[PDB]
Amino acid sequence: DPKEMHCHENWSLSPEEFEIWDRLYRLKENDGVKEPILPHTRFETLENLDKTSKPEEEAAHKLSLSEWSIWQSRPFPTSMVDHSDRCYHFISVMELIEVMRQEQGDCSYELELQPHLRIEDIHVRRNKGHLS
Amino acid sequence: AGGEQRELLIQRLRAAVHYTTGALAQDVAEDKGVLFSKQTVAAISEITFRQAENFARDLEMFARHAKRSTITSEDVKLLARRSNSLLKYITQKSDE
Amino acid sequence: RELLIQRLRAAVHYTTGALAQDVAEDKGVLFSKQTVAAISEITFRQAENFARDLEMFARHAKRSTITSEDVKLLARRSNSLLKYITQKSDEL
Amino acid sequence: GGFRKETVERLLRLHFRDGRTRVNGDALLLMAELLKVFVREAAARAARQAQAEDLEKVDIEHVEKVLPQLLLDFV
Amino acid sequence: GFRKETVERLLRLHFRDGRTRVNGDALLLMAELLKVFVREAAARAARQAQAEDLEKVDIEHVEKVLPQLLLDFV
């Protein structure tokens, strides 16, 4: 005879839990804050199986993954899940980019590799000259 | 669920994930002595919903890759194979 | 050894510049040497991610040889990337 | 606890591409724990960012700061 | 774009086990996947430069594109 856990053995919220979500966490018309939405995936070079079912996706706050690029040169602590090699590779390129923003690491990257360029490895192409 | 009349199920699951996110965030707030904003909890709920979509797609493709229709513990281990803390915890709890 | 790594980086750098030249002439833009060097480093590091996943995906299907279905499994998250490659796998 | 087993199965079958796909009970309980770990990780990282900025209220900017590295650990 | 043999060297460089091998079809698919990844990075960075009305793509556009780029290919 447990009236609390009686109403939620299911997948959705119980009527007691829906009341808590409505008053405390639900963003309403009263809330002068925009709904948080993650941006969708969109390819520039592939056919996009369009996920454009929401034309309302600008009455909301699009979570930016690049607004804090300057903070992304060093690891962002950790609670219980350590950083991955995928994440460390992303931090390394950001650290590389900030080193190159100071003019230094940009030209030297091309310089240190050119003695190692074995032509048998590459598909030779014509230097069109659109690199500044 | 497929291509028509499934927005209601999405809204109900969104609300359930939002409630669970708020309940877990309150315990994190007790542990660290901070308070979470409404919009912060809504953002974490949205992140969790899309990460659940990623997890479902990964698990289904991993199960189908091994000529299986049932998602088992090996699919969850292959999902958590990337982080040492996330992989060994699974081995700590999937076996248990 | 480090010499083998530099040899592969130089190949990725030259190939990245050649592909960026095709994109540059499609949009009428110019790529900085800093931009191609950054994209080349991302491509080199992405090759490690792909290689590590493919090896673990092959062992998941009780195989030691990486096949085309493992490459398809890399695109399991995006539909547009999944329909691509799959059509390129069928045509080879 | 966190998510119920039924909510996890409903959420996964919402995004399953095939109808014949099923989930074992052990894998379903593993995913409920994995989602709870993800929520706690996001909340703890955002809260410690607010603490590093000496703010007792976690706002949207602290989630946006930790978000790129957070998603890259769970890919 | 990428040659088949260099892709085989790039993959073998990061294999943790020695018994792992790659089939020819997977190598040709991986050469295409790598070419798409580079072209995707260049096209997205150029589109950010176009949004700023700049015909010259700098590393600032790479920072704008890198997080979503890594999250779209997995």
Residue numbers in the entry:
A (entry chain E): 673 to 804
B (entry chain A): 7 to 102
C (entry chain C): 12 to 103
D (entry chain B): 8 to 82
E (entry chain D): 9 to 82
Extract from the study:
FANCM is involved in eukaryotic DNA-damage recognition and activates the Fanconi anemia (FA) pathway through complex formation. MHF is one of the FANCM-associating components and contains a histone-fold DNA-binding domain. The FANCM-associated histone-fold protein (MHF) 1/2 complex (also known as CENP-S/CENP-X) associates with the conserved region of FANCM immediately after the helicase domain to form a FANCM–MHF complex. MHF stabilizes FANCM and promotes its DNA-binding activity.
Unexpectedly, structure determination revealed that one of the crystals contained the FANCM–MHF complex but that the other two contained the MHF complex without FANCM. It contained one FANCM–MHF heteropentamer in the asymmetric unit, with FANCM asymmetrically bound to the MHF heterotetramer. We could model most of MHF and FANCM except for the N-terminal 13 residues. FANCM interacts with MHF through an extensive surface area of more than 5000 Å2. The interaction is formed by hydrogen bonding, salt bridges and hydrophobic interactions. Mapping of MHF hydrophobicity indicates that the interface is more hydrophobic than the other regions. In the current chicken FANCM–MHF crystal structure, the corresponding cysteine residue (Cys759) does not coordinate an ion. On the other hand, Cys670, Cys679 and Cys779 are exposed to solvent; in particular, Cys670 is in the disordered region and may be sensitive to oxidation.
